Amino acid sequence: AKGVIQEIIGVVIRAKFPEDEVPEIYNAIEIPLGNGDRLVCEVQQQLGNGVVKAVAMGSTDGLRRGLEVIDTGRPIAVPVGPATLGRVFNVLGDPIDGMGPIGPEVERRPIHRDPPSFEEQNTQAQIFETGIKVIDLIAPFTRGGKTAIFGGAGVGKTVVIQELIANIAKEQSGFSVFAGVGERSREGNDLIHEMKEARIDENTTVFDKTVMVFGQMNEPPGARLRVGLTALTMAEYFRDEGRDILLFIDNIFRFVQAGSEVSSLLGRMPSQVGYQPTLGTEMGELQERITSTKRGSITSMQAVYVPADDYTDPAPATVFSHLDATISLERSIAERAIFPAVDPLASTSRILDPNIVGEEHYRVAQEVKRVLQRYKDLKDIIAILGMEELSDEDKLTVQRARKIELFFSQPFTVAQQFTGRPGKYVPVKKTVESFARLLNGEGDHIPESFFYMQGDFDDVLAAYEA
Amino acid sequence: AKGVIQEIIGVVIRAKFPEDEVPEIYNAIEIPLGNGDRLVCEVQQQLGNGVVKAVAMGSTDGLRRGLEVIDTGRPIAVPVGPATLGRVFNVLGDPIDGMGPIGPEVERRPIHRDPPSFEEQNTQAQIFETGIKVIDLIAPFTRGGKTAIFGGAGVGKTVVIQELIANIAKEQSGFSVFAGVGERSREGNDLIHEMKEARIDENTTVFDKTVMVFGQMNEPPGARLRVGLTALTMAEYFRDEGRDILLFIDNIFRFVQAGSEVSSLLGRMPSQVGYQPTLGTEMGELQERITSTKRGSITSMQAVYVPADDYTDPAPATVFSHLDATISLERSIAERAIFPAVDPLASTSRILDPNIVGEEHYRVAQEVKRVLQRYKDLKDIIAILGMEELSDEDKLTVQRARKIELFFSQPFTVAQQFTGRPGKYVPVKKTVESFARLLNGEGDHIPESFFYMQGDFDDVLAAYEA
Amino acid sequence: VNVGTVIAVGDGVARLSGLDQVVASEIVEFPPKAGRNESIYGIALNLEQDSVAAIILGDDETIEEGDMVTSTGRVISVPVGQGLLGRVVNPLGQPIDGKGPIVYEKTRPIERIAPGVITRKSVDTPVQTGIIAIDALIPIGRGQRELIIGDRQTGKTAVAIDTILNQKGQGMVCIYVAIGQRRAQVAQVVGTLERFGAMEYTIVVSATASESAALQYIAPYAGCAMGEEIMENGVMLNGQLVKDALIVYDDLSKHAVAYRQVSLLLRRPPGREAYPGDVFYLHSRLLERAARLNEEYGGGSLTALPVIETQANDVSAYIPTNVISITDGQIYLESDLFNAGQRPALNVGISVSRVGGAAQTRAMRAVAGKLKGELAQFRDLAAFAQFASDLDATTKAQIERGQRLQELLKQPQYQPLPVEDQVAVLYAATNNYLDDVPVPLITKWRDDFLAFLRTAHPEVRKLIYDNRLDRKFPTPEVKEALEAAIKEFKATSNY
Amino acid sequence: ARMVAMRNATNNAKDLVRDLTLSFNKARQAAITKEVSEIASGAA
Numbered sequence A, B: 001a002k003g004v005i006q007e008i009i010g011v012v013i014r015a016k017f018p019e020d021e022v023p024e025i026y027n028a029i030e031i032p033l034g035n036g037d038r039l040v041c042e043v044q045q046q047l048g049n050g051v052v053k054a055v056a057m058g059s060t061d062g063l064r065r066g067l068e069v070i071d072t073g074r075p076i077a078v079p080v081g082p083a084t085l086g087r088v089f090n091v092l093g094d095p096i097d098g099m100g101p102i103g104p105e106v107e108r109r110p111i112h113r114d115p116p117s118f119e120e121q122n123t124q125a126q127i128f129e130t131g132i133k134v135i136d137l138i139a140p141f142t143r144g145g146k147t148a149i150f151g152g153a154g155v156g157k158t159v160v161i162q163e164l165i166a167n168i169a170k171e172q173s174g175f176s177v178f179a180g181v182g183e184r185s186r187e188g189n190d191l192i193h194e195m196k197e198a199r200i201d202e203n204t205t206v207f208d209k210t211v212m213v214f215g216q217m218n219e220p221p222g223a224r225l226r227v228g229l230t231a232l233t234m235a236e237y238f239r240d241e242g243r244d245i246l247l248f249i250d251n252i253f254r255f256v257q258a259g260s261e262v263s264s265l266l267g268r269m270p271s272q273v274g275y276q277p278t279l280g281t282e283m284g285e286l287q288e289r290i291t292s293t294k295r296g297s298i299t300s301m302q303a304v305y306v307p308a309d310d311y312t313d314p315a316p317a318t319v320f321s322h323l324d325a326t327i328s329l330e331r332s333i334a335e336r337a338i339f340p341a342v343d344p345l346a347s348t349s350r351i352l353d354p355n356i357v358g359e360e361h362y363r364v365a366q367e368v369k370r371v372l373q374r375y376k377d378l379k380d381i382i383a384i385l386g387m388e389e390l391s392d393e394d395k396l397t398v399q400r401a402r403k404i405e406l407f408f409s410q411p412f413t414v415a416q417q418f419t420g421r422p423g424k425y426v427p428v429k430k431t432v433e434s435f436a437r438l439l440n441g442e443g444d445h446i447p448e449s450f451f452y453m454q455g456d457f458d459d460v461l462a463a464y465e466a
Numbered sequence C: 001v002n003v004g005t006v007i008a009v010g011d012g013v014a015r016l017s018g019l020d021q022v023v024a025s026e027i028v029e030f031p032p033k034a035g036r037n038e039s040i041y042g043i044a045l046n047l048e049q050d051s052v053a054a055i056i057l058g059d060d061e062t063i064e065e066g067d068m069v070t071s072t073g074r075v076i077s078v079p080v081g082q083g084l085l086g087r088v089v090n091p092l093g094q095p096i097d098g099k100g101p102i103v104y105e106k107t108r109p110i111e112r113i114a115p116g117v118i119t120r121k122s123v124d125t126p127v128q129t130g131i132i133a134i135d136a137l138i139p140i141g142r143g144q145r146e147l148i149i150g151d152r153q154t155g156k157t158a159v160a161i162d163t164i165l166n167q168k169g170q171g172m173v174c175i176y177v178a179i180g181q182r183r184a185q186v187a188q189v190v191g192t193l194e195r196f197g198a199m200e201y202t203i204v205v206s207a208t209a210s211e212s213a214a215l216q217y218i219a220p221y222a223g224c225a226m227g228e229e230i231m232e233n234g235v236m237l238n239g240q241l242v243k244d245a246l247i248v249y250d251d252l253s254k255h256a257v258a259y260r261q262v263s264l265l266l267r268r269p270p271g272r273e274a275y276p277g278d279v280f281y282l283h284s285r286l287l288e289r290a291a292r293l294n295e296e297y298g299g300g301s302l303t304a305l306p307v308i309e310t311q312a313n314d315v316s317a318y319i320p321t322n323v324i325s326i327t328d329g330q331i332y333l334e335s336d337l338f339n340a341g342q343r344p345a346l347n348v349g350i351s352v353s354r355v356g357g358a359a360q361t362r363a364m365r366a367v368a369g370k371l372k373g374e375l376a377q378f379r380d381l382a383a384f385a386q387f388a389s390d391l392d393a394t395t396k397a398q399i400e401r402g403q404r405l406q407e408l409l410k411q412p413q414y415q416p417l418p419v420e421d422q423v424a425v426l427y428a429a430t431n432n433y434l435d436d437v438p439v440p441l442i443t444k445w446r447d448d449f450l451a452f453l454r455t456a457h458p459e460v461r462k463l464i465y466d467n468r469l470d471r472k473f474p475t476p477e478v479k480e481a482l483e484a485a486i487k488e489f490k491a492t493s494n495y
Numbered sequence D: 001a002r003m004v005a006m007r008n009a010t011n012n013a014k015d016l017v018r019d020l021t022l023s024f025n026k027a028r029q030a031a032i033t034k035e036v037s038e039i040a041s042g043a044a
């Protein structure tokens, strides 16, 4: 099971093996470097006679055309278990944090696994209890579903992720996995590690409940391609253990881009705008592992970056074909001191129908976002009329819309040590009841700044009476 | 002959023949199918030593490499003669209707003939007298010239085709050929069969006076590419007898698309808008045999689909480069009960010049265009301000334009059973004089009615008197 | 024996070396070897010289160079018949619902020629969609190939599922193919069909996204073979030999994408949008098998409902244009209308059905003409809606009539209205009987009126359904009965 | 006067749309040519 390297063209290595010992299609290669460590390549194509074409996963700036290669037999094996919790890993599963290496006693599982069969898929969609009012009211999650974030930096996306991790770790076991796929090393690292180690909940850091796997843009295309599968393997272990898992994939579009680069370097013909021919299948082999079986569920909250603003681009289209809800963080809402910047509009979900959430939930979610359906288009008439000194009902609808916009904010248990305010966890029933009462009119006779930062309508009433 | 299949890639196959008797280009090699049926592939290329690349023109799903291939030594043989009349054929010339085989006693000609030589072309252009008032007046036909029709098929295009066939049958030699290039099996085949068999004229159905070649949608791109050539091969036999033939090609754009698909399958480079590089040559092999010769003339009225309504698009551009008259059926005109819903402003013709159709025809056509253009310009004024505000010497023009657009209605000799109104054949000279006498001032006292579904101006005078 | 050995395995593509006597679309076997107790089948598409490039139906991760293959002499065939009713199957006919083996006696080959020209008959019998907009303005008849074209999440599969649910006793065997859909989405669709009892006349093929591109490529053909068995020989449904069938290809955009991936991996020359040259031929073979057979050949049917996911309403794209040209009708579902609030997002201004009124019951055709005309008039004046105060009386009246009709066309999910209810409500609306009802209360009025007819006046509903085929539908006493029902309801209720 | 100005503006707006549609179509075809060139070049 030892071969020799024939060609080295960039990050694509062609290795020749004995006729009867050819590595499988997705096996590892582990080219041994002179200074002690190894370069783990991944086979992609068996071709010719005993020849395999593999992606580097590394620099390949120090390899000759005769180096031996040690086939491993199994695909990229990654450590999975409670040991791999609260640690940072690369695509190969080697921990890149300062702590020591993972002990051999920890079980290693292949990175490539088949998604759960159709028989095991749940026949009824179930809402995922996040606890955030705006998230659980307008754009509810899905147990074993996918959700996208459309927002830059400074809108609190990291804080939203931290709150989700804390809520899933408190209400349920909620072990979380974070997949840094082609993200900036400054944003993905040392502004996520520190903001999650400093962030705490019940004297336990958020970072201690989260597994991080980081393939950054500096890494070769294979690393950014398989970092997602590494994170899925880690989350799938805990899912098989029966614990609900929240898996975050940062910039899945970078996973698509890594696939495109791998295909271009592998000699495959381009498809559409230079993208890989195996785009849909590559997305399926990853997103289909994010599903809710009977024993456990892996809920996903991904972040999607669209090149320019082109949603017709094949990568966003293929990403969106595997989405159940979208959350659009907005700069204007963030700069208006409302920390959860989830725009009430442009934040849809396929769970928002009477047959899953319930008639009352759909009714209350439709009464809200209807007064906002215009985005308060009345703002223009106020702007050019001085409100006309009288707007009749429009004054009441404007007051109600402003009240709801203020009320969408919710205290963060991870930001409790920053803003000095305890975090409130609001179940979906509390959200629907509170918003039903607010739309009925119990929120009237109460001025603004009393719905600014509170958990429930009952909390708002308690603040008003005090 | 007696070659063997060497390669089967989709509909493109490669057959290996001995070093001699290699089939020429467009030689229609035949593959036995283990029964009476056979698969006919047209050779499109000669490669290397005996290998010829051909387009399957069939299912090519049961074939195996090494299977015997029979060379016919000539392009696709198509039955021609009076036996073809009242029969429906595919591209191969095999009848697809319920009747039996054509038989060996009937002459078969190569599908790939040659356009008439330079000397055989008519020096002068002769008008083609269709008999329809609007067609003969605003967009006159040309004997031996191409004609395009634009419509959504819900505007009575088939009725116009039937009227043209009946008119040529009853007032000329009258044999018509319908080329169903990419014609739907349900919408475009049985429907047209029933309309042509039900439509009758002088105890002879329209179906009995025409031959229809259907290259259906479900057939491979080669069949849809060569169905037009099959139709021309059938029509050229009747043209060689001195008869005048109307060739109807349905959606010539589907012929262009079939050519593009064949070129892509063969591996040729894509021209502008991914069209075949041989767009001009392919459009010239067709639509150049449609000429007016010394012996006879073939005049074609071809439906054209404009891709995304893009006329600059090289497909409609190359179609327009070979056109003489354009007829634009309009949905709005058809919404009102005017069956010949021809848009006078959009429909033009090359032959509508003083040097051919005479000074009077040109003058009356130009005056009709001017008054209808004024009516179109004043539509918005009438809709906004109303009839009262429009001044004098223009209200008369508006009334005349309304009466003249109701005058383009004409009873059809094929629709006398459905509408209970006998068809009227209006000569071009009679049309010109009637419209001149309508423009000069006669019939002004007559209201908008009595012009509807009428023929000559004397007819509307008689109707007004009675 | 004539077998072959794999010489190169790519991204799901083998080469199989010297495997002679292989048919151009056989299903090779890959017999089990050491470490693999099952067999993975593959479709031998490229029959090159000294090479047979076969795409892999199963998983490609296990087939290594040097593996032996045996060419089974059979072209791809699927089980068909009664035994498939209410079972989820692979495009190969292998069950995936985990409820036992498929019971069958006949296998209809995939990829058979279209029924033919003379074999068919004009479409006359209607497919009651159950959605007022479709069932009134875009008729669908048995044998018609109506395209449900939309833009991402707009309601296309919701429309298809509503149509499939509405055939509870319409004597129609529905089929749902689900090409490239997520396993969760197909599971939810099957759960919805089971929940409403529609899983006793439905066959749900499924080649999900994680499945290899070969399965997604052959899924619609397996579905339409299963439907052709119903169309030609029929199955026993509710004790009646039903020969009609309805087939829904949930994404032909994803099917075309899968075929593009297969072609590119097989190194076939690309075309526009990297699609192979014969993608139009692919979709035409698939759709043209949907036909309305005449009485000579059985009188069966097969209604096809292709679904396309366009991007940014780019109708001029390659696959949307191909399928639009192929199909007999289009149902555009616009995201703008979906987000505005009109949940069935039909864009009537551009959605067309070339079959027309021939695919509508005589009652429905008599009632819907005025509705279509009034909706067109309202659309032509959509820019004046915000200027309603300063308008002519007739223009205003047209505007609120259009608003009432548009609100009436709004429908919930999984609520198909039988034909009698649709015709009753649209007769109520076309006649100046809902003018007094405010615009936001039209849907409530319609729901209450159907409840009233269902409970208080079953006789009028039975009367409308009994003579829906009369050429002059309004002539019978049914007219007065319906008028009395409307008047009584409007008297008892207030809005 | 407003009616005349709006009618002129609507006519100018409609003329601009026709000009823009004419320009958009040229950009649509050029986009197709670019793609059909890279894919064909990438094939070889």
Ligand SMILES: Nc1ncnc2c1ncn2[C@@H]1O[C@H](COP(=O)(O)OP(=O)(O)OP(=O)(O)O)[C@@H](O)[C@H]1O
Pocket: A321, A349, A350, A351, A352, A353, C150, C151, C152, C153, C154, C155, C156, C157, C158, C159, C309, C343, C344, C411, C412, C413, C414
């Ligand atoms: N008729 C309807 N009534 C109520 N809600 C509807 C209706 N149609 C669609 N919806 C809503 O829209 C959501 C998405 O609809 P649907 O699944 O049909 O979309 P789609 O176009 O098939 O999308 P995808 O591309 O994701 O498959 C549904 O979950 C439901 O909330």
Ligand SMILES: [Mg+2]
Pocket: C156, C157, C158
């Ligand atoms: Mg869908």
